Design a protein around this ligand. Structure first.
Ligand SMILES: COc1nccnc1CC(C)C
Ligand code: NA
Ligand code: NA
Ligand code: NA
Ligand code: NA
Length: 157
């Protein structure tokens, strides 16, 4: 069974726990390239009453650094906002809770904006079929595959 955070049957408690960044995508590719602020490796999602605590690590010169962020529910169901390198809002267009989670985020900084899409897995990698489903979801948002970066070969410290 699958759901979308904006859907009526979404059960947020079911996305609690361990997650790993498998693939990131963006219509501003530099944001997720080696030195980008959005090249974030998710570790866990802690589900609270009206927020999600997101725990990540970032990488620089082969050195990991821990980063935690709190995302608050907005006025629209299934949407959350969080301040990080500008103002972000995001939703989870598709997840099956037990294997993958696909997120779509809009960042706004210095009067500009860009889209970020992320595929996270319960294990450190996902099947090629799920990775293809993610590439299709990116295409529906106008993000070319050349702007999709598989990070499954570099998501561990
Ligand atoms: C700031 O959030 C993020 N930034 C980079 C990568 N992934 C996320 C998780 C979101 C999309 C739910
Ligand atoms: Na580039
Ligand atoms: Na909106
Ligand atoms: Na969408
Ligand atoms: Na969206």
């Amino acid at each position: 069974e699958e759901a979308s955070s904006t859907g009526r049957n979404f059960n947020v408690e079911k996305i609690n726990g361990e997650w790993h960044t498998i693939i990131l995508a963006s219509d501003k590719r530099e944001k997720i390239e080696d030195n980008g602020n959005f090249r974030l490796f998710l570790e866990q999602i802690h589900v609270l009453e009206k927020s999600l605590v997101l725990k990540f690590h970032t990488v620089r010169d082969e050195e990991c650094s821990e980063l935690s962020m709190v995302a608050d529910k907005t006025e629209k169901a299934g949407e959350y906002s969080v301040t990080y390198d500008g103002f972000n809002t995001f939703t989870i267009p598709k997840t099956d809770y037990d294997n993958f989670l696909m997120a779509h985020l809009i960042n706004e900084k210095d009067g500009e904006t860009f889209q970020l899409m992320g595929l996270y897995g319960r294990e450190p990698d996902l099947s090629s079929d799920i990775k293809e489903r993610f590439a299709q979801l990116c295409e529906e948002h106008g993000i070319l595959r050349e702007n999709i970066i598989d990070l499954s070969n570099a998501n561990r410290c």
